Ligand binder design. Structure first.
Ligand SMILES: CCCCCCCC(=O)SCCNC(=O)CCNC(=O)[C@H](O)C(C)(C)COP(=O)(O)OP(=O)(O)OC[C@H]1O[C@@H](n2cnc3c(N)ncnc32)[C@H](O)[C@@H]1OP(=O)(O)O
Lengths: 249, 250, 258
């Protein structure tokens, strides 16, 4: 609602979901929560079969995980929040909708939780709009399921390098490694996303959905079957006094 | 008659030419002719490599014969699918060197045949597009064919290619990696002979053990649940929407 | 030493230079020196990255030492293979940043070493070919090495590379992805230093945990079946047809130089 602007075109069967959590679309719990609710409503609305995800304001697609949500909070809150992080990944990655990311800003690790779970990724050709899983730069590591998603996007070798170096690929490099599908002038990102979704939405819907599910079920299952353990892993880590301290920078 | 096997002079390599006009559709009869012909060549110690190609250029294979899948009884659907599986299993695990000289369009089931080979050469004609276009008809590739594609072009590219049901023209096919070479159409056959010579020069047992190490896990995923896959095929293809699309198409 | 270590503790990097002439063959002796040298650098808190290269350009490593595998006792073959496995395990799971400065030809066992590194730079000399050429010797790559190759270049390319036993010259090596950069010969060492400067700058533990996340499944496949894999090597290499293939190849090798 507040933090997610939905612009629907029911006649076309398309909606645009614009992120509106300034200054940087950080993944706060309200934002994570609002994103999933909004996606779910578009899923259950049979009028809508494709969604374009983008920032309302260009510059930052999403800054990623939000520090306020993870600093000096309750054990309860941490569990609710990593559960909400997982939920967003799961619901995006398994959505029956066609999902296209119109990446009109920088896209570090948590922004990649969103971009990598879409069906197609278009990046604006702005040298500031770098994309990748940069966890190691901050002294942390990608969740296994996010690593898996990246491996599913760019292959094992490139994921090994990208994750260890915590690379944020500038647009030409991002295209070359395959983390995005197209790079276009910034003024053409939304038109390119429209052209892309027209093509994807034209596929017979059930067959497309079944095909998508066959491709992604093993990866999604790995998180569904270990989900509580994965929350506990997060909680134990960030509940540490010493990690809490290091959040302090 | 549906499959011509032309031994090269000096043996070693044979050319298998598809001849089930008009589009080399994989009828049940053609499927079993391909399997027997391949087995003969395997068992003949004079032959260790085969080039697969159409007798007439234009269409490599249109794929599955939709008439085997539209008017028919549940048992017919099941026996047909068992034969489709058999062809994939036997090609994919063949001890022969298999090279495709792709001298025509190569949609879904044709692309199956191609993807099971060790090397794929595509004639440079803009009509000769290759891919797994099942979703165009509202159908999906079976898991083992999806795995064969992923094993060819990687996960991301397969995710896109299968969902969009894409047929790649030659330059795009080469870029995505679904074929290994693109050459002028009047050179496809000679190029295949040159390319298979590289493979024929490998110590034969070592080559075969290596091929098996690369492919056995993928094949075994189907071997372990082959009857399940037949019943899933029969249930899926028997749905009324699917039947209507095939009949319309036919 | 057959392994020359040149340290730069202030920069946190050491260069490990192979010096087992004439072609840095992986004898049992040399294998164990490499394992120990790597463990000493791991344990030394001053070092976090290592560049592997040949002291003498021309051959990075000729790979496994055929004289260890030809006409020897079954226990010799087993002990040899346990050491080969040990080198792969230690390299592949090293907590160090490992960069190969590939300054020579790099056939199968050499490629074992290169593929276990985090980054591979190949000198642009048309004779400096890299690949898993086991099938040209009438043998095959072990499953774990096949997995390492697939983890480097993907399934399709591994299929072709392994069956054909390809030794990729530099341009083809870069195109297939088996190395990460191809540079003029006189830049291979400087490129490796530039590369490793960047890798060593990453928060160390996070890098290590990430590397483990990417590699533990592959390594575990050998660890859990390790003595079976020794048994399989001995049984396979002992076949008379394989002994024959290996002694013919050895004989061919000797003839091509003397
Ligand atoms: C189931 C699992 C199975 C097994 C997995 C095995 C993995 C493997 O490593 S297999 C071996 C792969 N290695 C090779 O193919 C390299 C063989 N060597 C060569 O082609 C060349 O020697 C090469 C590349 C070093 C070029 O150097 P160059 O100086 O031009 O040639 P070369 O004349 O051979 O070198 C000189 C000496 O090194 C020896 N040599 C070279 N390679 C080897 C080797 N792999 N083993 C032992 N000796 C070797 C030569 O025989 C010769 O001396 P000598 O006959 O007295 O031992």
């Amino acid at each position: 609602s507040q933090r997610v602007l939905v612009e629907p075109d029911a006649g076309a069967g398309v909606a645009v979901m614009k992120f509106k959590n300034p200054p940087v679309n950080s993944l706060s719990l309200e934002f994570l929560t609002e994103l999933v609710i909004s996606l779910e409503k578009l899923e259950n609305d049979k009028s809508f079969r494709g969604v374009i995800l983008t920032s309302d304001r260009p510059g930052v697609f999403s800054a990623g995980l939000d520090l306020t949500e993870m600093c000096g909070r309750s054990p309860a809150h941490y569990a609710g929040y990593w559960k909400a992080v997982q939920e967003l990944w799961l619901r995006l990655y398994q959505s029956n909708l066609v999902l296209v990311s119109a990446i009109n800003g920088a896209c570090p690790a948590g922004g990649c939780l969103v971009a990598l779970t879409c069906d197609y990724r278009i990046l604006a050709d702005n040298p500031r709009y770098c994309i990748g899983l940069n966890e190691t730069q901050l002294g942390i590591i990608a969740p296994f399921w996010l690593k898996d998603t990246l491996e599913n996007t760019i292959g094992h070798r490139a994921a090994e390098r990208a994750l260890q170096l915590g690379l944020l690929f500038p647009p030409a490099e991002a295209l070359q490694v395959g983390i995005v599908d197209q790079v276009v002038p910034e003024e053409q990102v939304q038109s390119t996303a429209l052209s892309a979704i027209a093509q994807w939405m034209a596929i017979p819907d059930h067959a497309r959905q079944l095909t998508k599910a066959m491709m992604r079920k093993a990866t999604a299952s790995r998180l569904v079957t270990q989900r509580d353990a994965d929350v506990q892993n997060f909680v134990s880590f960030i509940s540490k006094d010493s990690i809490q301290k290091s959040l302090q920078m």
